[PDB]
Symmetry: C2
Subunit: 601 residues, 2 copies
């Protein structure tokens, strides 16, 4: 077995040289293994994915809109760990509790488990294939709809790609098993949001236009992104044609009062339009928030498993289900099941001890109502300062964030945008620049590549326009983008890229691989060469994958399905073998050894 | 200076032999120092403590009941850290942010900062005087009311004390600066609750009778502790005379729905009675819950600073303040201030890294709706299991907890009671006893000392009676307590105890000390001998206290107020000096050395 030995070499390697992917927090994966509940044999109870197929996104939206109780979505597979564990959860652990979900959470609206950071991190850090993840799970959960976070601007990539790809991406994603597409734009720049809605709607999937939330519509003071701001935007999005409408409060800024307001005026304007609410518990509301949303007529709300909820993540699924039963919005989900599910996750999370923000973050923070830093980014900046004894610092950067944000014309901060305000915020602090010093001396300073490209609109056009008195003194003799960036981009010959990959990585390369390579040229490449020589490192349980094997400890890995592979380390030490070393394993009935390179560790 | 050298010897000792008080989690106190905001010079803005004094608990309650916005209480000084940090926060760090509080949180209803575990821990583990704490803080915050958790049954002790002490306790406490007394009974056994109310009322303080909450009044299924159960209990407590009425949801089981119900029928029955709600965010509601209580007419709700809220503690103060502004329930508290306040606590908590439940607990858990384990006990049992790689176990015990509780007739689990179900739950588990095996074999097994005395009523009589078919087969030829246990207890000759202490510890012993010794004979004794030889270990900053000083690191300690004491370690090594060693400090302008005992460390 070449599949076999490829992995051995790997295990051996991690033993000799240690961890392959970065480990931000010095900690070994919990020695305990996640508790996987029991599940009856045979097919799931069948939930919405069934209806969808049976009637399209058409009847779907209706059933959704006409469902009595509150409906939910599980972000535990995507945004939940993307916010708490540096989006490091591996397919392996996701496949584990999959059969459970399929059997227990059929009443489920959708299940977020793809899109977002994941596509990137899957190759850049976990060395697994994002497509495999999908197919492997779609296989395990045929009854629950699959949702992803798609960026209208550029699918799951980091830069503008020709529009021919956005459609081909969704085309594939759709066939591979994706259903609901949540398209968003960091500036709510419709052009990008509609392109996303296109590829998604044309791919034949469910379009769920997502509006990113800033400030507080309840507060009449601020008028930039006023209630009427959103309301207008919806019209366009609804006209452009969307099955479901979602409100992406990525910063956990939605207050109950603001909620009641927003949703009602929305339910009023669109009586039978499905409404989906996404918030992060960063401020401390979330639950109280979501509850208000239902009250006012919201159809669904995003939640995460208790053990993976709270703080920069989504509100406690169990708290929502609990507070909602006995009422006309009852979710009808057995508390018992949320327990076993959270149970699993509390243990699963134990493996990702090396990526637990829990190291620096011991709770939420209402100051988010001031800096407007989204959940994910919050956690990271927090960890950064504190991880280097600089909590004192964090206060300061947060203030530079506000100024930076105001300095660019008060913005909507999400992946694209949010990270540009970040660099500028840091640029100012690390250079001691008051907003005034920053603006006045703006005629010439080396502002972040991200900031300059933003003002050139590479992403889009901020509502209210660019801070021109400043924008120009910055841009100078620089090319300012005109129109939807992706527009002026010539297509991407897929055959040129296709044989260009077959020619190299193999006669294997699949449509999927092509796309991946497309979005992530290098990262994909590296990911391919790595797995090339190390086998299916994705079938390895997280512990072995991170920490590597323990000398003498018996263990097994399910390669494919006909093999179980029982291995036990025991023996390494050839300290000098021509500048190397050699380890031996007792693979199944026999035994063998692979040679590693000490890398003078 | 004897004050001086006494501390030196201590510091040195810690250097040579290490930590004096147990340290559950191996971690050193953060090297960063909590950020203490700025506070104007001169007197605070004055709040309710002022009104109180000017009009007695009579005008106070009215003002409370007639105040427009929602009122709050800060448990950050007591229940917040008692649930999260093993009640280990020191007076030193409480004095620091005190002036700030006095200046910024005048609108505050009360401030919980005393009572509960504190009195015990203050001597048992921190080696500080609980009275000192009170006096020192009363000094720093003369404008905000001081609240404490007083146990009707036995003030701040662990056993039945003759009622003469219960009155003498509140008498002293009241004069020392305590105002509002929250009196509670673990089984809501009126006899004990009234005794507390008396001492509290008689002492001339504000009586806030507390009803302990269980189950879910919204849920018609369970009828033991039905709505009409509480409603009736209210009548008694109000007739017995109480200025304010509080609901102690020590387990965080209060759902919004159950809330709206409870409070309203309460505000209905008592139009102008002040209502105070206490909850723990354990389930995930809390905030959502409290918001409901207000909606329905609740006058005050307990909260903690953001960095100290969440999980088994109280809801995010900032989340409440945030979601409540702009509405008729506006707290009027400047978001800005809750920020600086949490800012301070996030850092102060970094000093207590050795007691942070954060180590095992990374979030709340809605399964609380099933085991009914109060916030504090949850945290402990969770740390327990997991701190010894036994999370797998924790599930099990939670199950025994339910059976144990059901086995004792379904109870209200708070400090007294709650820990009895604990022992029983663990007894069963650790002896493999189904609730059936536990009961049938009850005729004779060595049930916990706590469980036996419970059935003998040493605490009180459980509503619905004791589980007799069992109770008896357990008790056998054992004495069953008749009436409020404290009643049958002969007074406590205070002079006998007074001269008894003077005679020993010194001609210093104060009325306070007497009471302390009373409730905590030994603990007090040890606490006294320790401080006796080591000086004011309470004027030491938590870092030096826990971790001791760092060789060559310059530092200072504010002994009293006329001395600043600048010390620098540097030099220890007399490894063998007659089985000891010797360290040297460079105290202020001069230098000197103290001789320690290596304890063959
Ligand atoms: Mn999000
Ligand atoms: Mn409590």
């Amino acid at each position: 077995q070449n599949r076999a030995q490829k992995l051995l070499h790997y295990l051996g390697h991690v033993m000799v040289n240690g961890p392959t992917t970065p480990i931000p927090v010095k900690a070994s994966p919990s020695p305990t293994d996640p508790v996987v509940p029991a599940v009856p044999i045979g097919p799931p109870p069948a939930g919405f994915r069934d209806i969808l197929l049976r009637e399209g996104p058409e009847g779907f939206a209706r059933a959704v809109r006409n469902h009595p109780g509150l409906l939910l979505m599980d972000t535990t597979f995507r945004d939940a760990h993307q916010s708490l564990l540096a989006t490091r959860v591996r397919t392996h652990d996701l496949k584990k509790i999959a059969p459970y979900v399929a059997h227990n959470f059929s009443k489920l609206f959708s299940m977020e488990n793809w899109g977002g950071a994941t596509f990137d991190v899957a190759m850049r850090f976990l060395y697994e294939c994002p497509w495999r993840r999908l197919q492997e799970l779609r296989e395990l959960i045929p009854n629950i709809p699959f949702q992803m976070l798609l960026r209208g601007a550029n699918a799951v990539g980091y830069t503008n790609y020709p529009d021919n790809v956005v459609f081909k991406f969704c085309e594939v994603a759709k066939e591979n098993g994706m259903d609901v597409f949540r398209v968003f734009d960091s500036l709510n720049y419709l052009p990008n949001m509609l392109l996303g809605m296109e590829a998604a709607g044309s791919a034949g999937g469910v379009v769920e236009a997502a509006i990113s939330y800033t400030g507080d519509v309840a507060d009449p003071s601020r008028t930039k992104y006023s209630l009427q701001y959103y309301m207008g935007l919806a019209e366009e999005l609804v006209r452009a044609g969307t099955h479901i409408l979602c409100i992406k409060d990525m910063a956990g800024l939605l207050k109950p009062t603001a909620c009641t307001m927003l949703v009602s005026s929305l339910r009023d304007r669109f009586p039978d339009l499905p409404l989906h609410i996404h918030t992060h518990d960063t401020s401390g509301a979330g639950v109280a928030a979501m509850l208000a949303c239902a009250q006012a007529g919201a159809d669904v709300v995003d939640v995460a498993a208790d053990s993976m909820s709270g703080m920069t993540s989504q509100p406690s699924m169990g708290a929502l289900v609990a507070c909602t039963r006995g009422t006309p919005l009852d979710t009808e989900v057995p508390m018992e099941r949320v327990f076993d599910y959270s149970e699993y996750w509390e243990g699963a999370r134990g493996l990702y001890a090396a990526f637990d923000c829990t190291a620096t973050m011991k709770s939420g923070n209402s100051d988010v109502y001031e800096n407007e830093i989204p959940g994910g980014q919050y956690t990271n900046l927090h960890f950064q300062a504190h991880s280097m004894g600089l909590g004192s610092k964090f206060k300061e950067v947060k203030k530079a964030y506000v100024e930076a944000n105001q300095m660019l014309g008060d913005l909507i901060k999400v992946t694209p945008s949010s990270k540009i305000v970040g660099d500028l915020a840091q640029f100012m602090v690390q250079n001691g620049l008051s907003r005034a010093e920053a603006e006045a001396q703006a005629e010439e300073l080396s502002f972040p590549r991200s900031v300059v490209e933003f003002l050139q609109g590479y992403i889009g056009v901020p509502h209210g326009g660019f801070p021109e008195p400043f924008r120009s003194k910055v841009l100078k003799d620089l090319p300012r983008v005109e129109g939807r960036p992706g527009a002026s981009l010539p297509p991407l010959d897929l055959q040129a890229l296709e044989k260009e990959l077959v020619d190299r990585h193999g006669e294997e390369v699949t449509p999927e691989d092509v796309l991946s390579a497309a979005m992530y040229p290098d990262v994909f490449a590296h990911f391919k060469d790595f797995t090339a020589t190390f086998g299916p490192l994705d079938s390895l349980n997280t512990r072995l994958f991170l920490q590597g094997p323990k000398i003498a400890e018996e263990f097994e890995v399910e390669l494919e399905r006909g093999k179980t592979l029982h291995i036990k380390a025991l023996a390494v030490s050839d300290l000098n073998r021509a500048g190397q070393r050699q380890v031996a394993f007792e693979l199944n009935g026999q035994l063998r050894s692979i040679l590693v390179k000490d890398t003078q560790a």
